[PDB]
Amino acid sequence: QLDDSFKNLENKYDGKIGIYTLNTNIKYNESYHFPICSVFKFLLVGAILDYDMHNQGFLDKKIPINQDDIGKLGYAPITAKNVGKTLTISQLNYAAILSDSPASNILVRELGGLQNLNKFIKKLGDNDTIITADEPEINYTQPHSNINKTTPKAITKDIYKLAFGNILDKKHKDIFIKYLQDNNTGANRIAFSMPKDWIIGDKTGTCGQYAATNDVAIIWPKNQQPIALGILYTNPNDKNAPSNEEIIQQAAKLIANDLTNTYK
């Protein structure tokens, strides 16, 4: 019946919705591949934190922000205010989680490139996520290729493992969690449907094609242990279809209702 409800959303809006939750189990199309879009930025920040663990002091390292870092990238809320100055790696992490594109490309470079990122993703246990570019090329996919795509299961296990698992230590988990909680781009996605006393941190993704609209979250239900929730949406049949936040809202509400029933 949760299944029936998710199917109704697909009928209503076209395309495919993918859902996975992880407890300390609601799932739908959890092994279907969806454009990852900007969601990759939380994997990147995870990789940076792991790097810091192996390279003490890295988070405090000062990075020059140059005009060519910005380039023709339009969404640069933090980096654009710092051209000709420097930002620490940690400040760039914050920016990346807030979806700052130049910040993300800088981090990929300072990590040592995409090969290192993909190595880290494999270390997480994720063999479904395939990243072959940074911003903005990461946003371009093809319907039948898994390049630059992930699955609800893989990406949701990833965020849970990073925030609560055994790859980052306590100090670095707490930092990761705080970045996600500071994010402001998902107000109209999962957060929109959570009870107001539930705490959430999240990373969104919006490709600008194939209606690709994502939100992957950690949620602390009142008086319960934290859970992870990934909701991915795409219409592989319409390259020009615009993003759709409402379907995420409705899927998240179904889930919130079910969880509340569970905890009751």
Q: Are strands 34-35 and 149-150 parallel, antiparallel or unpaired?
A: antiparallel
Does residue 38 carry a catalytic annotation? yes
Positive or negative, the CA dihedral 204, 111, 31, 264 is: negative
Look up residue 166 and give its two tokens: 């055994």
Q: Spell out a b/e string for 15-39, using b for 16 or more CB atoms within 10 Å of the CB, else e.
A: bbbbbbbbeeebbbbbebbbbbbbb
- Report the interhelical angle of 245-263 vs 2-13 (nearest 10°): 170
Three-state SS sequence of the chain: CHHHHHHHHHHHHCCEEEEEEECCCCEECCCCCEECHHHHHHHHHHHHHHHHHHCCCHHHCEEECCHHHHCCCCCCCCHHHCCCCEEEHHHHHHHHHCCCHHHHHHHHHHHCCHHHHHHHHHHCCCCCCECCCCCCHHHCCCCCCCCCEECHHHHHHHHHHHHHCCCCCHHHHHHHHHHHHHCCCCCCCHHHHCCCCCEEEEEEEECCCCCCEEEEEEEECCCCCCEEEEEEEECCCCCCCCCCHHHHHHHHHHHHHHHHHHHC
Q: What are φ and ψ of residue 50, in 5° steps? A: -65, -45
Other CB atoms within 10 Å distance of the CB of residue 109: 13
How far is 54 from 58, CA to CA, in rounded Å? 9
Choose, from 5, 38, 90, 99, the residue flagged as catalytic. Answer: 38
In terms of C-beta density within 10 A (0-12 exposed, 13-18 middle, 19 or more buried), how is residue 156 classed?
Answer: buried
In sequence order, the β-bridge partners of residue 217 are 202, 229
Reference 94, options 177, 193, 21; nearest CA is 177
CATH architecture of the domain with range 1-264: 3-Layer(aba) Sandwich (3.40)
Name the region of 229 (left: φ>0; alpha: ψ -120 to 50; beta: rest): beta
How far is 263 from 243, CA to CA, in rounded Å? 32
How far is 168 from 74, CA to CA, in rounded Å? 32
Close Cβ partners of 57 (under 8 Å, ≥ 6 residues apart) = none
* Cα atoms found within 13 Å of the Cα of residue 259, Cβ hemisphere only: 28
Residue with tokens 């988990």: 173
* Cα atoms found within 13 Å of the Cα of residue 136, Cβ hemisphere only: 11
How far is 19 from 232, CA to CA, in rounded Å? 7
How far is 78 from 101, CA to CA, in rounded Å? 10
Cβ pair 117, 108 in contact under 8 A? yes
In sequence order, the β-bridge partners of residue 203 are 216
Positive or negative, the CA dihedral 6, 131, 166, 94 is: negative
How far is 184 from 203, CA to CA, in rounded Å? 9
Cβ pair 108, 40 in contact under 8 A? no
Cβ pair 103, 48 in contact under 8 A? no
